[PDB]
Coordinates of C-alpha atoms (C1' of nucleotides) and ligand atoms in Angstrom, one line a residue:
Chain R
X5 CA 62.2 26.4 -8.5
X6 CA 64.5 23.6 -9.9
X7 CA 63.9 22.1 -13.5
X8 CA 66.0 18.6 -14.7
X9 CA 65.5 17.7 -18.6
X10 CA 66.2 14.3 -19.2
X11 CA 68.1 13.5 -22.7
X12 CA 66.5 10.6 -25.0
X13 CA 69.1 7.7 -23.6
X14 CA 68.9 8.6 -19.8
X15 CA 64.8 8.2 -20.4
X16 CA 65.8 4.8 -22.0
X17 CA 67.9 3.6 -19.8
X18 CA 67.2 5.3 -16.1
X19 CA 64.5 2.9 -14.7
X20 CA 66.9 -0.2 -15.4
X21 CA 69.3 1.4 -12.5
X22 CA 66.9 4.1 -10.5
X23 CA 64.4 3.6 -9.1
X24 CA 61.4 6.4 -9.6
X25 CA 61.7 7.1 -5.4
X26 CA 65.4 7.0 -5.5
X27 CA 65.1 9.2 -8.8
X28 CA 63.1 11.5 -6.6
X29 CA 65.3 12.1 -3.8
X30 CA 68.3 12.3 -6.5
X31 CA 66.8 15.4 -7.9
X32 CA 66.1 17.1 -4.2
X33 CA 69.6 16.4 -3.2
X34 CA 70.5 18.4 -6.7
X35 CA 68.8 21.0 -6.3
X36 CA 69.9 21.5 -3.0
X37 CA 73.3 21.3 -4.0
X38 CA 74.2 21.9 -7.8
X39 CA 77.8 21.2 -7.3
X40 CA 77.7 18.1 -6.0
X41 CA 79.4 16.1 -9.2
X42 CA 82.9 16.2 -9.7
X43 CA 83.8 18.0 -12.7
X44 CA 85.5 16.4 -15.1
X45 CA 89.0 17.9 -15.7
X46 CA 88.9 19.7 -18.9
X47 CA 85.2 19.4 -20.0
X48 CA 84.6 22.7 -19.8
X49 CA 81.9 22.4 -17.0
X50 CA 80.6 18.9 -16.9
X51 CA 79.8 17.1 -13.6
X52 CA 80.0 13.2 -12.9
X53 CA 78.3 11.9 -9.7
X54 CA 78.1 8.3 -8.3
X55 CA 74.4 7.8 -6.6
X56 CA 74.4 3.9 -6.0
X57 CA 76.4 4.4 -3.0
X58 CA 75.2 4.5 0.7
X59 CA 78.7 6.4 1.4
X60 CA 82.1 5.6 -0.2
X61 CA 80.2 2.9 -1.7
X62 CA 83.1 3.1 -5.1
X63 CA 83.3 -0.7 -6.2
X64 CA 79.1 -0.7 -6.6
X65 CA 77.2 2.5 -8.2
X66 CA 75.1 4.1 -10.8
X67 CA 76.7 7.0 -12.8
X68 CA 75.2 9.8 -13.5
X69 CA 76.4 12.8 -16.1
X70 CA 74.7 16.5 -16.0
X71 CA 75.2 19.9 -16.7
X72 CA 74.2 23.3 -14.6
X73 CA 73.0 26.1 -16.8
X74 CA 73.2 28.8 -14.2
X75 CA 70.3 30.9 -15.9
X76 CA 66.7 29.2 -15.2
X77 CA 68.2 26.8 -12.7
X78 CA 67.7 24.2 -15.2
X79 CA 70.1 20.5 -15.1
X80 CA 70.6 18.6 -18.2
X81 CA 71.0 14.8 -17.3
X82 CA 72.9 13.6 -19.6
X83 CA 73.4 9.6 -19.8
X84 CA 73.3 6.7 -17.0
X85 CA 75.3 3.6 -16.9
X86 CA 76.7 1.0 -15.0
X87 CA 79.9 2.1 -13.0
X88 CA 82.1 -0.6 -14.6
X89 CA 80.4 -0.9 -18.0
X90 CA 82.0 2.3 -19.8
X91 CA 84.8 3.3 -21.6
X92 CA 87.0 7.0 -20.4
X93 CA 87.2 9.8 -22.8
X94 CA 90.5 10.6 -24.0
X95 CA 92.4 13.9 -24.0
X96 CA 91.4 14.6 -27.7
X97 CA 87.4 14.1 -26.8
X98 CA 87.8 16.3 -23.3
X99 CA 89.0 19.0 -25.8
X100 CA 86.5 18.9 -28.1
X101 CA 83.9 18.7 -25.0
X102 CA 86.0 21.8 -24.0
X103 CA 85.6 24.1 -27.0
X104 CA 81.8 23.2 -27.1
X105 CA 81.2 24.2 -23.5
X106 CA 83.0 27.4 -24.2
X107 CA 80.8 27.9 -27.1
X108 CA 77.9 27.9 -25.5
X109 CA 79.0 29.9 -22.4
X110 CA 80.2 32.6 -25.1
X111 CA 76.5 32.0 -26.7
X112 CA 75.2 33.1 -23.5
Chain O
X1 CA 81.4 -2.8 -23.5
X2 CA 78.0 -2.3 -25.4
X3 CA 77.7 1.3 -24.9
X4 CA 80.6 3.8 -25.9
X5 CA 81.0 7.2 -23.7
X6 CA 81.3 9.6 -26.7
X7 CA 78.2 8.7 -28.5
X8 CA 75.9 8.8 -26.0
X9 CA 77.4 12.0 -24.1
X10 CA 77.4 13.5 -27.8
X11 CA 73.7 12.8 -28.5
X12 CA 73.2 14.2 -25.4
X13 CA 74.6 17.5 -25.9
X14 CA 73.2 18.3 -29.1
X15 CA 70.1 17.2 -27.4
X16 CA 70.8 19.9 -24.9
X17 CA 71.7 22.1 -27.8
X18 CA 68.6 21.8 -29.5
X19 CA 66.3 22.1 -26.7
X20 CA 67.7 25.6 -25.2
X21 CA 67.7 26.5 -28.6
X22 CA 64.1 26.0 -28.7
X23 CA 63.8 23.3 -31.4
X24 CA 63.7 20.8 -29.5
X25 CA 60.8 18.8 -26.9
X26 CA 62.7 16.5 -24.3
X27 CA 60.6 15.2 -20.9
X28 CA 61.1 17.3 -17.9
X29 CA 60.7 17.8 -14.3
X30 CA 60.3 19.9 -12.1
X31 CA 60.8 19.8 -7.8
X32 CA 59.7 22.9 -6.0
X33 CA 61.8 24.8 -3.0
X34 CA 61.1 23.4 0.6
X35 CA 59.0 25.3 2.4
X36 CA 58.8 26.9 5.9
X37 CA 56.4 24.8 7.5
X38 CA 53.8 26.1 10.2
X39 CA 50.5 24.5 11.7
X40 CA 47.9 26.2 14.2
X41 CA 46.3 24.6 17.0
X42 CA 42.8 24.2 15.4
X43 CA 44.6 22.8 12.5
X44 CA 46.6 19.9 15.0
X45 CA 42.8 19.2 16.1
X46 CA 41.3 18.9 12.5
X47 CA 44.1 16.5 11.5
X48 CA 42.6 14.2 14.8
X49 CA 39.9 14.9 14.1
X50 CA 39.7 13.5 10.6
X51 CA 41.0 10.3 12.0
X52 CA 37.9 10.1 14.6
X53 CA 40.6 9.3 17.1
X54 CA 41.1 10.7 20.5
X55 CA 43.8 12.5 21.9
X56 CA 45.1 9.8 24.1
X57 CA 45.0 7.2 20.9
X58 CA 46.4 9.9 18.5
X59 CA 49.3 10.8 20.8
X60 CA 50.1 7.3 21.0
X61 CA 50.1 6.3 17.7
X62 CA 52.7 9.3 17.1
X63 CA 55.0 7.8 19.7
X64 CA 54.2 11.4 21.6
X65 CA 53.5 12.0 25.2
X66 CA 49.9 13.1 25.2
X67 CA 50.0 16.2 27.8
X68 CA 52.3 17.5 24.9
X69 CA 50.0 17.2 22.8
X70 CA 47.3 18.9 24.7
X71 CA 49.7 21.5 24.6
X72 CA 49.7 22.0 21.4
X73 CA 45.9 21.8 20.9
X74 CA 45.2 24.4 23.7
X75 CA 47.7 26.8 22.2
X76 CA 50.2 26.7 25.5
X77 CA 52.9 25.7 23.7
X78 CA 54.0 25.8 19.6
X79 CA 55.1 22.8 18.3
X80 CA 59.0 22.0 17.6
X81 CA 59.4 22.2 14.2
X82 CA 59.8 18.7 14.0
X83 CA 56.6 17.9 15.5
X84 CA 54.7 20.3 13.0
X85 CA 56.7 18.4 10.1
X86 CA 55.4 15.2 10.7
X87 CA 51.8 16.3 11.8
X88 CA 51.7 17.7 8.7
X89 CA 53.0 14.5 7.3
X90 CA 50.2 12.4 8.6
X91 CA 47.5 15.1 7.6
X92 CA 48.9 14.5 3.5
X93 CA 49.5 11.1 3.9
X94 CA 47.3 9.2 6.4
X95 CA 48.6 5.8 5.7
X96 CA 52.3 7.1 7.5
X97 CA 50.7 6.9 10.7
X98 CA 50.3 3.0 10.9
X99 CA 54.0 3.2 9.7
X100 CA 54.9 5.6 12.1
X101 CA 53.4 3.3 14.8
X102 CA 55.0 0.1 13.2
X103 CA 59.0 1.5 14.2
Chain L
X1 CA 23.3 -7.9 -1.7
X2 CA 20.6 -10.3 0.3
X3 CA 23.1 -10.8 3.5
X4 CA 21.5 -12.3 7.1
X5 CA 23.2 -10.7 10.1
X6 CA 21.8 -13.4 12.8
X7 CA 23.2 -15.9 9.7
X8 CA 26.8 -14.7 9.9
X9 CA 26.5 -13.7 13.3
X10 CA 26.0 -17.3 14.2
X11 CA 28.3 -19.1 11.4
X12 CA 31.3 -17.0 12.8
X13 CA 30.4 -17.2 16.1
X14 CA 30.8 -21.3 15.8
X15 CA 33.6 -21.2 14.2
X16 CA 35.3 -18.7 16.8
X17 CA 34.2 -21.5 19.3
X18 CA 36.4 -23.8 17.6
X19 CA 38.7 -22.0 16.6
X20 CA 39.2 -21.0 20.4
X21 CA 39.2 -24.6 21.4
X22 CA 41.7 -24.9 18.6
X23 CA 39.9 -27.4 15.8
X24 CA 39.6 -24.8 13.4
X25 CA 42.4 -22.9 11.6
X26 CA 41.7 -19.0 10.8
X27 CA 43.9 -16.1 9.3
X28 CA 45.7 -14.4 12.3
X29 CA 47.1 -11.0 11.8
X30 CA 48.9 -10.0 15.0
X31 CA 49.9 -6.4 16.0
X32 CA 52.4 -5.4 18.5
X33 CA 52.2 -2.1 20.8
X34 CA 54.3 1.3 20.0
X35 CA 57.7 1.3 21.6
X36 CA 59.8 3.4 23.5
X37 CA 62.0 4.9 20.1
X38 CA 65.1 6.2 21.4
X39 CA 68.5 7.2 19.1
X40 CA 72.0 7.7 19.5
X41 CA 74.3 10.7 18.7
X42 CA 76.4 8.2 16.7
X43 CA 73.3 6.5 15.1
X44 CA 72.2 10.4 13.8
X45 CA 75.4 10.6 12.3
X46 CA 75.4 7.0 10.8
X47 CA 71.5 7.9 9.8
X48 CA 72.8 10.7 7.5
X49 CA 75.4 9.0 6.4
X50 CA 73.7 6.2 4.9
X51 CA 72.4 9.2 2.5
X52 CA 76.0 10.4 1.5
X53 CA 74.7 13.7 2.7
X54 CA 76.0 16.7 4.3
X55 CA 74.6 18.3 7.8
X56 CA 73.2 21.4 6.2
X57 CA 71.5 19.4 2.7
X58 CA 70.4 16.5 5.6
X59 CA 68.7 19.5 7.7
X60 CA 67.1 21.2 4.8
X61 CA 65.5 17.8 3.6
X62 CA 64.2 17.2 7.3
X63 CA 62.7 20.9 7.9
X64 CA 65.0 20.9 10.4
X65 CA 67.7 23.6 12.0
X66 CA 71.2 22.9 11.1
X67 CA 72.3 24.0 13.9
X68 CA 70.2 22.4 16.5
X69 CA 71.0 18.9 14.1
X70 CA 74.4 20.1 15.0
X71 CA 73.6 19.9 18.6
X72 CA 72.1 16.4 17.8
X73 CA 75.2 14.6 16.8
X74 CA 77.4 16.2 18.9
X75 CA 75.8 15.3 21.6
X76 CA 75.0 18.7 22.9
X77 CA 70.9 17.8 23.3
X78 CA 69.1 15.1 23.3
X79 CA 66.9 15.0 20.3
X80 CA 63.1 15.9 21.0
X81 CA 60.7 12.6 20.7
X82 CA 58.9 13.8 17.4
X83 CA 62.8 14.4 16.1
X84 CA 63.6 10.6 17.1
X85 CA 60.7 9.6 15.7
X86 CA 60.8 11.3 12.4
X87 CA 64.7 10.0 11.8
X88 CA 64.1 6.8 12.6
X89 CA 61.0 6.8 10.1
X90 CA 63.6 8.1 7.7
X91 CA 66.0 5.6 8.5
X92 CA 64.0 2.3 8.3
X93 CA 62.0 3.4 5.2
X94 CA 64.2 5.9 3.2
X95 CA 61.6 7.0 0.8
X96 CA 59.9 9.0 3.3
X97 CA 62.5 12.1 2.9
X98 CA 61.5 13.1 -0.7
X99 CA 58.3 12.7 0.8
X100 CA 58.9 14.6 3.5
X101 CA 60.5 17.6 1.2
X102 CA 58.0 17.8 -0.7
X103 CA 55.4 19.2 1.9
Chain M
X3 CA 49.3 -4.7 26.2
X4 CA 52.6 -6.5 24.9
X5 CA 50.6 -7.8 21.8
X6 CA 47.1 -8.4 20.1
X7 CA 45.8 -10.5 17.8
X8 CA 43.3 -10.5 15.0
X9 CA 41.3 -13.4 13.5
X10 CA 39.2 -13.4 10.8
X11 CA 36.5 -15.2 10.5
X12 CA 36.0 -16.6 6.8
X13 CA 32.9 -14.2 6.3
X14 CA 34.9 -11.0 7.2
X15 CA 38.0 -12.4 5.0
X16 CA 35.6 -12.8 2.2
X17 CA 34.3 -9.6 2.4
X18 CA 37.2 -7.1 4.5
X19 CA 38.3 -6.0 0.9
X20 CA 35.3 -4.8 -0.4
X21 CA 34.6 -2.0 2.5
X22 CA 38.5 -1.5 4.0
X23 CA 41.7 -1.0 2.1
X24 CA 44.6 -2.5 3.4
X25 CA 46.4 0.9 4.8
X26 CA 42.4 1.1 6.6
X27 CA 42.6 -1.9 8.2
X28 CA 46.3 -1.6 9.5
X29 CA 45.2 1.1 10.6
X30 CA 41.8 0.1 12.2
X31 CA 44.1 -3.0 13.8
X32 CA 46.8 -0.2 15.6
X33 CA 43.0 1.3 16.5
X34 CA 41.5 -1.8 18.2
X35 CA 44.9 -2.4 20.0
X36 CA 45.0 0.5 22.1
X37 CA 41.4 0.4 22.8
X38 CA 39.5 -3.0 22.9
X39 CA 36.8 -0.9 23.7
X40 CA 36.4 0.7 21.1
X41 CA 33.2 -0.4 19.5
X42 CA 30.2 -0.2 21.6
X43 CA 28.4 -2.8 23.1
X44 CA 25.4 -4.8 21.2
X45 CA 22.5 -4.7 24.1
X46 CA 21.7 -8.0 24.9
X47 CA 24.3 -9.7 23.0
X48 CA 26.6 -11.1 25.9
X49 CA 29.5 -8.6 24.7
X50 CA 29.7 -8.3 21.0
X51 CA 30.9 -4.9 19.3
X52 CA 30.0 -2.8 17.2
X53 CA 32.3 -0.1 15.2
X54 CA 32.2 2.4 12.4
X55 CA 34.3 3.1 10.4
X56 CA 35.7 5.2 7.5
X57 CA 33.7 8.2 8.8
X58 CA 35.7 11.4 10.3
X59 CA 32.2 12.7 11.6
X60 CA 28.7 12.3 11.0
X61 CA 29.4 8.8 10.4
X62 CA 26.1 8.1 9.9
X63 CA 25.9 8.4 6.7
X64 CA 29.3 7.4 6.0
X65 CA 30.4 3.6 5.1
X66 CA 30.5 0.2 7.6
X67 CA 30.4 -1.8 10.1
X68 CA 32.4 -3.6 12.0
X69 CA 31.1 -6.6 14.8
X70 CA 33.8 -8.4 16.9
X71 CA 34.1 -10.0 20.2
X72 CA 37.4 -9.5 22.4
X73 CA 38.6 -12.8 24.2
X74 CA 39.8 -10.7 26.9
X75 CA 42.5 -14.2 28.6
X76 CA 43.9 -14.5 25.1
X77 CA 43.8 -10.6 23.7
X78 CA 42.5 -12.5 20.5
X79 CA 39.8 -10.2 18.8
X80 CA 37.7 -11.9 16.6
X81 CA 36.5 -10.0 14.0
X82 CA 33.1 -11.7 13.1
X83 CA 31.5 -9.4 10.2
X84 CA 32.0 -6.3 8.0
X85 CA 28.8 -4.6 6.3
X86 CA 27.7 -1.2 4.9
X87 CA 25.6 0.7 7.5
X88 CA 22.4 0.2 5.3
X89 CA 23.2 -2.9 3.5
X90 CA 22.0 -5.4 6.1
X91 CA 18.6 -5.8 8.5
X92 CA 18.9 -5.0 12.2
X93 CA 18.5 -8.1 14.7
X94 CA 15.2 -8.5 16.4
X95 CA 14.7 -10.0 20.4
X96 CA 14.9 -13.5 19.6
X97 CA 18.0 -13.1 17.3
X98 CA 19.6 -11.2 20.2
X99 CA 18.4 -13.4 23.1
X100 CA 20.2 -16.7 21.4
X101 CA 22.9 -14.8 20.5
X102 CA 23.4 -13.7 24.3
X103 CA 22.8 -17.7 25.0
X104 CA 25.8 -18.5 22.9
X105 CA 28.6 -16.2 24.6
X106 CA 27.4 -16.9 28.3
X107 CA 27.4 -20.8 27.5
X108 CA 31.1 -20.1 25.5
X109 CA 32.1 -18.2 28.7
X110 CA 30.9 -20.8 31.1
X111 CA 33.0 -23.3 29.4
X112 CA 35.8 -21.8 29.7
Chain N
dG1 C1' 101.7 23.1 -4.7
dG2 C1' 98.8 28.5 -2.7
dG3 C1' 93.6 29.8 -2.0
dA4 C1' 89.0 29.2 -0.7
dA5 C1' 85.5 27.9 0.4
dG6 C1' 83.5 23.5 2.5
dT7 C1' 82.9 21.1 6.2
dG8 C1' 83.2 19.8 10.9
dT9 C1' 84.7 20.9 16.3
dA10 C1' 83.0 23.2 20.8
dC11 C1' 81.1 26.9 24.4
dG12 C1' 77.9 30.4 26.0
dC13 C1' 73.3 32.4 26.2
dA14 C1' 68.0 34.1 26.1
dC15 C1' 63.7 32.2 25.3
dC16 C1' 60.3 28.7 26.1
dA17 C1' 59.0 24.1 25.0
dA18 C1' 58.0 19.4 27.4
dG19 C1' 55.9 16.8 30.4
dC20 C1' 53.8 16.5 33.9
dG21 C1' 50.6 17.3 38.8
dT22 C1' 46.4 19.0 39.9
dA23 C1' 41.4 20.9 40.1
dC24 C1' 37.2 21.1 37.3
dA25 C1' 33.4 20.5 33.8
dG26 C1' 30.6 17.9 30.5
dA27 C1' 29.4 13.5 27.6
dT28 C1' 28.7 9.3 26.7
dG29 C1' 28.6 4.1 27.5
dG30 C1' 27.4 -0.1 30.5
dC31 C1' 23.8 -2.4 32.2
Chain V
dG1 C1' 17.9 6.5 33.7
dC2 C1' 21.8 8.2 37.8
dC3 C1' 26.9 5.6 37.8
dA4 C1' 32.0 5.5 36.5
dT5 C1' 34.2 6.1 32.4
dC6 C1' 35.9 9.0 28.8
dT7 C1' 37.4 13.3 27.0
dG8 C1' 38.2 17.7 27.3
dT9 C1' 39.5 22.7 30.0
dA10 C1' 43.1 25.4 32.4
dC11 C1' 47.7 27.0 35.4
dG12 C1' 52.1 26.3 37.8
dC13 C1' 56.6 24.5 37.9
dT14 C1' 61.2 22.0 37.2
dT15 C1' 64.3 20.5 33.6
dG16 C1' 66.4 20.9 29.4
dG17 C1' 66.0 21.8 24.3
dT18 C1' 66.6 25.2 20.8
dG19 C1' 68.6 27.9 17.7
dC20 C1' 71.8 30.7 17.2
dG21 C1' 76.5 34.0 17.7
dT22 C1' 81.0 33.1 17.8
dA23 C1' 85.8 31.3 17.6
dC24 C1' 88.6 27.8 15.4
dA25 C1' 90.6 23.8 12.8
dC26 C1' 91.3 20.2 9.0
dT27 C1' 90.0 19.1 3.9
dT28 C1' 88.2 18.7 -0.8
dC29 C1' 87.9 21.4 -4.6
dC30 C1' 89.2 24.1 -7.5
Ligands
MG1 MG1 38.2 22.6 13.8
MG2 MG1 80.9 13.7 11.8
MG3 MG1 79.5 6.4 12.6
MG4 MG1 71.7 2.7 9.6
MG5 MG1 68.5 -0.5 8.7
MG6 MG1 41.5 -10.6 2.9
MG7 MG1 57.8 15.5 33.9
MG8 MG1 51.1 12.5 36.6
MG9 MG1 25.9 12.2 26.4
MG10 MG1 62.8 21.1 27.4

DNA sequence: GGGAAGTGTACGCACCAAGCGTACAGATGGC
DNA sequence: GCCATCTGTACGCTTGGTGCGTACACTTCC
């Protein structure tokens, strides 16, 4: 009743951090809760959630980006990454991620 | 750092763009709801049955008193719900109950 | 295949001779008995935990009342055996909830 | 029954794979543990066993055999062969009779 | 720095499951 | 070819689980 769409570098990349079974339980744990990444402040909409972590686990972790399209109960996973291997995006690149986001919510 | 945020969360979106645009093909999964799950008596004695095991030997192996689970068989009593989740467990996948012994 | 019962019977049945009188080494593969599981309102909680998971998603994963989970690690019940059982499955080999959500 | 053990002889090593996966024969192990009793008794045979296997009814037809003997002061089965049910020829009087002379003498010395 | 869910705490209560004890009734397995 | 053994039937009963229904506080996120 859930449906995830991976983008072109989380395919590349997820099996070098996830696990398929780990992968598996990631997406029930989504569906059962779609707000369970942070959202970024001023993204217009985008989550951020840590799943390498067995609780509080902060210093060690996978990171994972997705968006929630309400209709269709659809996620877009966006990228994966190492939690220490990535640059922040700056205040000129949230608003630009802001006005696209808005965009497409005025699309829809 | 070999990877920069932008780019890849920018490919990504235009990506996602594309695809609820419809111009787009991307690999995707689904996972269906949980389900209310329910089990008969004659179904708790086919699952036994297709072990060839008896009642004593079965309740054992699920670390369950047996009486109970000539309970459930006869039809005295319905199973707690968490009973009927890991019968039905072993019925999909048989191998779980030499696990489920193993603990 | 062209296979001799008395033939095997007979070559297996000297070496368990000497293997029994121990001149003779053979793959051993020992089993022990099921156990008396037991759990811990505070090993529930620590259980869940390990998941990063809230009561009510931890529940829904488990085909299992929130509420009476509730009643679990608060101590207000103890847990049935089938419910010990079925978290401590969980808890020594993790991959079993997907599994166990997707029934 | 604190704990049991299973030997394999180098015939049913050789051949365990071909008839049993290894979740079957954990499984058939857990089996045998609660009930050394499990196979039925070869007449004539001083105590060897006989089970089948990978059948949930009419096993007949179905796939295997199993022959063992439980060395009952040790718990130590000893599984001796593993066959498909028509793959092999039955034992005759003679086969049976020495067979029964080897577990009595085995017994006696011990 | 306010508001609102989002999580937990605990108690009471009707139904009934759990796990026997106990008396019987067949079905097989060991010589 | 007449035995425990093995494997099932059924009912009664004491103890406690179960799954809320409800009131009520901290807290993490908006
Ligand atoms: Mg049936
Ligand atoms: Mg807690
Ligand atoms: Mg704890
Ligand atoms: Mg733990
Ligand atoms: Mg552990
Ligand atoms: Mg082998
Ligand atoms: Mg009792
Ligand atoms: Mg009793
Ligand atoms: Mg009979
Ligand atoms: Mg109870």
């Amino acid at each position: 009743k859930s449906v995830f769409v991976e983008s072109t570098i989380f395919e590349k990349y997820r099996d070098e951090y996830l696990s398929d079974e780990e992968y598996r339980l990631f997406q029930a744990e989504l569906m059962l809760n779609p707000k369970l990444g942070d959202v970024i402040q001023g993204t217009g909409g985008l989550r951020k959630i840590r799943v390498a972590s067995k609780g509080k686990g902060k210093r060690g972790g996978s990171r994972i980006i997705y968006y929630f399209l309400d209709e269709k109960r659809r996620f877009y996973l966006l990228t994966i990454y190492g939690k220490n291997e990535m640059s922040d995006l700056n205040a000129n690149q949230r608003k630009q991620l802001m006005a696209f986001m808005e965009a497409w919510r005025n699309e829809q | 750092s070999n990877r920069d945020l932008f780019a890849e969360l920018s490919s990504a979106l235009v990506e996602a763009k594309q695809h609820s645009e419809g111009k787009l093909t991307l690999k995707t999964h689904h996972v269906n709801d949980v389900g209310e799950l329910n089990i008969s008596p004659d179904e708790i004695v086919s699952i036994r049955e297709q072990f060839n095991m008896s009642r004593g030997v079965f309740a054992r192996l699920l670390h369950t008193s047996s009486r109970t689970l000539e309970n459930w068989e006869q039809g005295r009593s319905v199973p707690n719900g968490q009973a009927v989740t890991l019968l039905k467990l072993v019925q999909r996948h048989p191998e779980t109950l030499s696990h489920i012994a193993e603990l």
